[PDB]
Amino acid sequence: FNLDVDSPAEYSGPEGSYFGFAVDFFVPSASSRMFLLVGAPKANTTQPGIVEGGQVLKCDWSSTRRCQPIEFDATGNRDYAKDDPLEFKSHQWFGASVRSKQDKILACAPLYHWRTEMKQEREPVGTCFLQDGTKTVEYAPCRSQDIDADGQGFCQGGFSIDFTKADRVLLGGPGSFYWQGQLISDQVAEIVSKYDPNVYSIKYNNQLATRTAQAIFDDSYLGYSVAVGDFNGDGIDDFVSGVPRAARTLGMVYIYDGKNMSSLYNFTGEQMAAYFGFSVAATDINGDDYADVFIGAPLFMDRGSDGKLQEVGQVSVSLQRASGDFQTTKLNGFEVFARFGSAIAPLGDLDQDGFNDIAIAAPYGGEDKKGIVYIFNGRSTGLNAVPSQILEGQWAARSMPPSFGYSMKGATDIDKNGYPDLIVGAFGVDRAILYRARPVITVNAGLEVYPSILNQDNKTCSLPGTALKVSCFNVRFCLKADGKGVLPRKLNFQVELLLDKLKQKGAIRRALFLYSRSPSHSKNMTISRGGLMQCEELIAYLRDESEFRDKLTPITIFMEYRLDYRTAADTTGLQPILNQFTPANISRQAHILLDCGEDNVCKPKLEVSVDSDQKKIYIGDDNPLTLIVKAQNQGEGAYEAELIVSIPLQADFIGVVRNNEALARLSCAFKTENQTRQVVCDLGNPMKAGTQLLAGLRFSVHQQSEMDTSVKFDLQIQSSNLFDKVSPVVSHKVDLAVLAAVEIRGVSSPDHVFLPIPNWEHKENPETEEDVGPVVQHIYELRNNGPSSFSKAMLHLQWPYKYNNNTLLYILHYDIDGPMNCTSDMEINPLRIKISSLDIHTLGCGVAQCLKIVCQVGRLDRGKSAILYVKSLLWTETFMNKENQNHSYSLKSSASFNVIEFPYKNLPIEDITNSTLVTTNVTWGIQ
Amino acid sequence: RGDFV
C-alpha cells in the first residue's frame, strides 16, 4: 500500500530507443550491491553496419543513475558467402526481453533475421545472448535446419523469456510453424557448455520443446507471454504461457510440465479479440504456498453502467487450490482504452504483512494517457480487489504514448530497508522509474481516564489560579509502536487530547485542563521497541456546575496523534508510514454522576425480549426475516447501552424498519469485527431508567445446507456500568422448512391429426415411418420450482398402446433430459421400424392396452427440470370408414410423478404428487 | 496454410 512517490529513482535514455521497453534487477552473487537492467531496442550501437541493434543497459542505483550499455555482441553481420550475409542484425530489437538470474543474464533480439543455409532468405528466427560476467554464449534455439514458415523460420523465439528456479530457461517464440507458437526450455549450463561459435544450429541434449500441431492451430501465437511456477503435484517450475489468438481470437493460457513439457492445464478467454494472454504471471498471492495464475486481457469489454460495451481491460486471477484445479475471479479496468491487464508484475510482500503483492498496469491510462500502475495486496482469502495505491506517469508524449507501466519488475529490495522495490518502464519517453518501498510501522493507541464517572460535588483537587477544590479526574494516554525492517530506534510522535468533543462550536467545553484552563492540550512523545510503550498523563477538571447544564451527554476525550519525517535511512531519507488500516484516534468517555444517588452507583436492570413473527424459513432462496426486539432498563441509568445481535453465517443485516409506526429507529450498525458477525444498536447512551424500546431488525438467511433443523440468533444488552453491566443472553431460533413446488407439464407435437391422410399406402409388412403414418410426439417434463430441492422422485407414464388387439400410436423410441433413467414394461419398436429411406372419442389406458413407462428420478434443485421425449407413429389403422361412425378419436397418454426423498434429514416433509394427460386427436378431416 | 492453404 505504500512506496515513496516523492523521490523515485528516475533513469533515462536516448531518444527513439524505447529505453524501458523491458526492465529487470541484476543482483550478482559476487557483489554486495545490485543494479537495474533496462532493455532499449531501437538503440543504435557501435556494431559495424548495424542500425538499431538495441542494447540492454546496466544502471547504477548508486544514486548516480548513470546507465551504460552491457557488451553482448559487438561484431556486426556474419557471411555465408562474399556479399551474401548470413544474418542481419540491424533493427533486431535486441533488448526487447531481459532476464537475469544470479550473475547470468539472458537477453534477446526477437526481430533478428536470418538467411537460411539453403536459399537466399531473411527469416525472423530471433536470437539471444547469455552473459556471465565475462563468458558470453549465443542462444538461438530457433535458428535451425528446420526452416521456412512451416518450421521455425518465423519463430522470433526470445519474444518472451524466463528462468526456472533450478536454472533452466523458458523461452517463447510466436511464429513457429504457421504462427502456432512455441515454447523451448533448455537448461543453462547446457546452453553454455554446448556453445560452439562455429555451429549456427546447435543441438542441446535435455531440451524441452513444443512441436508443430494441426493446421487449425495456426496463428495462435503461443509464446507471446511467459511466466513460470509449480502446478503439477511437485518439483520445480512448470511452464505457463499465454496464447492470445488461440480458440479463434478468444485467447488461452497453456500450462506445461517442467519435466515432460506435457500439457498440465488450460485457460480460455471469454470474449474475442480481447487478448487473453498478452500478459501472464504466476505468484502465490495468499500465503498458502501455491502459485496463482494471472492472465491479462487489456482489450476486454465489460458493460458500463448503461450496459453498453466498454473496452477497459481485464485480469483473470486463478487461485490454485489443493486438489490441483483452480478458483478464478475477474477484475476489470477503470478507464477505457487504458489497457488494464497490459502488464501484471509481482512484487515481494510490499508491506511485509506476510502475504504477497502484485501490480497491474494500464499504461495508456490516466490524464494525458501518461499511464497508471495499480498495486493490489494479498490476504488469506485471496487477492484484495481494490488498488491500494496508484503510481502515475509524469512524462509528456513527444511522438507516441509514454506507455508508462508497459513493463515492470519488482520482487527485490534494491536497498537497505527490508522491503521489495519496483521498476516501471515507459518507452514512449525512454525512461524507467525505480520506486522504493517505505517501512511500515503499526502503532497502538491508549487512552483511559481515571475517574470515568466524574462527581459534580466532589472537591478532590486544587485549582491552579485560585486554591479551590474542583471535581477532579485524570487522563493518561499510552502509545506503543512496532516496526519491521529498517526504521526503529527514534520514534517521534505528536499526540493531542480533546475534552468533551460533543461540543462543536457551541463552546460548552464542560471539561478543562488544569495548568492551562483549556479543553485542547497537545504534547510531543517518543518510543522505539514494538513492545515498549512510553506513557504520560494529565489532570483535567469539571468547571463549576453553576456555569453549565447537561443532564449528561458523555464528556468524550479524544486522542489523536501523528508521526513525523526525519525518522529513516540516510539514502534520500526514506520516511516510514503507519499501517494501512490503523486508526489515528481513540476516544474514551466520562459521564457526570447524576441520578445514581445514595446507592451512589448506577446499577441498571437490562432485559432483552424477542418474538416468533413468521415461525419458519424455507430452504433455498433469501427469506425475509424480521426480529421484534424489546430492550428495557428497570434499574438505574445504563451508560453506553447497546444491543448486540449475534447472527449466524447464513444471515445478513438489511437495516431496522422505518416502514412502521410502533417500531423504533435504533442506530443499529452491522459489524463482524471479531470472529463474530454482530448487529450492535445504540440503546441511547445514558439509557435512562424505565426506558422501554421496541424496534425491528431485518435479516435474510440463505441456508447452511442440511445444517440441523434451525438457525439461531443471540440477544443481549451491554453497558459500561461497573455493576449489573449487562442483561441476560437471550437466544432466538427459527425453524428451517421444506418447500418444493414440483410440477408436471405435458404436450403433444401434432396435437391433432386429420385422417384423410396425404398419400399413404397400406403395407402387408411395413418397414418405415412413412409406411406407418405420421409422427405424434409427446413431451413430458417434471420441473421443480419450490425453493427446496428433492433427491429422489418417481415418474409414471401410461401410454395408449392398443385398442382391441390393434396398434394405435406406436412408440418408436424415447429420449431423456436431466437426471432420470426410464423403463418400458414392453419392448419399444418390436418391428425394428427405422427412420427414413429411398370410448366414444377418448382412448385412455382405462379403455385400452397399456404401454407403461416407469422413470427413476433423482435431484432436481431450485429451478431444474427433467424431460421425457416420446417419439411414436400414428398407425393409421384408426381407419374403419366402412361401418358405424369411426370419425373421431382422442389418443390419450398420461404421466404421474411422486416425489419420494429429500436431502434434508430431520426436517419435516410430506410426499409431493400430481399428474397430467396429453391428447393427440385424430379426426376424419373432411369426413 | 497462411495466405493460401
Add this chain to the structure above:
Amino acid sequence: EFPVSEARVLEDRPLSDKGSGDSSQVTQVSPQRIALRLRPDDSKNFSIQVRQVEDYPVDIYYLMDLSYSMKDDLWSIQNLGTKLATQMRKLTSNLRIGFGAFVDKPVSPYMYISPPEALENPCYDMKTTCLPMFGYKHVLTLTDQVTRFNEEVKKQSVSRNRDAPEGGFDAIMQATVCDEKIGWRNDASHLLVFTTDAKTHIALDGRLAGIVQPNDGQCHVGSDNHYSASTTMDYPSLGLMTEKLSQKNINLIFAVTENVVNLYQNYSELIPGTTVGVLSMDSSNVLQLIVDAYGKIRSKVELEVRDLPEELSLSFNATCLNNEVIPGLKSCMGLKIGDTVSFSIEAKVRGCPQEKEKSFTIKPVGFKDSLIVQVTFDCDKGEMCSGHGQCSCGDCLCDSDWTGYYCNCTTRTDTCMSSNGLLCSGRGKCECGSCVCIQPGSYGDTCEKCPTCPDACTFKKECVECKKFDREPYMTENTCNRYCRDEIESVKELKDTGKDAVNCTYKNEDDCVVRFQYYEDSSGKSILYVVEEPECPKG
C-alpha cells in the same frame, strides 16, 4: 415555487417518406432541439419521434481483401457496378458507390520479407507475378457512374503475403475516418461492405512486426491514396472501430466466404449494428447481401445518448407498435423502411451542479438527425439512509441507471435480450435486467427455453390465417405485420422437398383443412408455403 421547464426550441417536422429533399431539407427526428431548465432533484418528461424515411440516399464503399486467396473470388466483381445499382434501385433514387482494397502490413513478418530481392513483386517462388502487397489502397471514391466503377474494379488483382490473418481492420478504420477522401455524404445511408477470404489481424498482433504504438483512430491516407501509418502503427481494436464506426454514422457489412462466416458473426456480436453476409456460390458476389443487409441494418431503431452530464439520468418508454407503449426501453425492432416511432425520454438531475450550457444529443444510430438538448439548472459519522448498493443519503438517491428503494434495480435491458434479439424470447418482461417469464410453461435466462410450448404449427397458423386469409386475431389486433414478418408464399398445390423443415395442417373457421410448411435456408430465412387450394367439404 420551482419553475422546471423544457421549451421545445426547434421543430422541423418528419418528412413523409421524402427520400429526396428538394429544398425540403430531409429530417427524420421531429423534435430537433429542446431546452431543459431544472430545479434541484427534478425531472421533466419529453418525447422524440424518428422516421425511417423512404427513398433515403445510399453510399456503398467496398473494402476488398486483395491478397492471394481471393484469386478464386473476383472478375465477376463487375457485378458491383451493375449488381449493387439494380438491386438497390428499388430502395433509392441516389446511390453513390466506391471501393478500396487491402492486403496487410507491408512489413517484417507479414510481408514477403525480401527473400530473393527479386520478390518485392510476390508469389514468384511459385510464379503468377501477383503484384506487391500494399496494406490499404483507396482506388475509387463514391460516385454516380457505375460503368466507370464496373471497370476500375476489373483492373484489380490479387497480391500476396504469408500470414493467414490479413488485418484489413486497418482499412475498415481508414475507410471510416477519412470522410474527405472516401466522399461520405452527411445526408445519405452509409454502408461499408467488408469482403474477405479468411481470418484477420486484431489489435496487438503487430507487436511481432515490432509495432508497439496504438491506432489513433486518425485519418492517415493522403495523396498517394495509401494508409501511410500502416507500417508505423498497430491494427485498430474492436472498441475504436466501434466508436469511430458509430460517430461517422457508418454501417459495417461482413460479406465473407462460408468457411469463415461464424467468425465474423461472432465478431459482429461485439460490434453491435454490424451484419454478416455469405458470399459463396461461385465468387464475385451473390444474392446482393447489401440489399438484404441494408434492409436488415434498418430493421431497428435504437436511441443513443451522447455527452450526457453525470447528474441527470434518462429513463425511457418506447411506443413501437401502434400506441402499445413498451416501458423501460429505447429501441424498436421489426421495422420496415417508412415506419415511424416515438420514445418518451425523462431527464432528471440529483441536486443540480454548476451552471453552463451542457448541451447533449440523443439520436438514432446510423442517422445524422439528432435531438440536441441544452440543459440549465435553477439552484439560485454515520448516515442510516443506506443498506448499500448505490444508495446516497438524506434517504436513498440512486445514481444513473439504478432504480428501486435499495437502488439494487437496474434500468438495463441488454441482459434480457435473446439470440433473435427479442426481449426475453418474446415470452416475458425484463425486470431489473432479468426476465421473469410470463410462463406459457417456460423458463431459462431469457425465457428462451420452453419444451412444453406448443408446436410451431400453432404460432405460424395465426399468420397464414392473417396474411393469406385476412381473418384471424393477429389481424384483429392490427399487428399482423411487424409482429408477423416471416415470408409467406402460396405453394403450387404441391409440397416442397427440403427435408429439414416441418409441414403443418389445420382447419380454418371455414371448416377447410389448410396445409402449410415452415422452412429456414441460409440467412435464417423464414419462409412459409401454403398449399394453394385447401381441402374443403364437397357437394
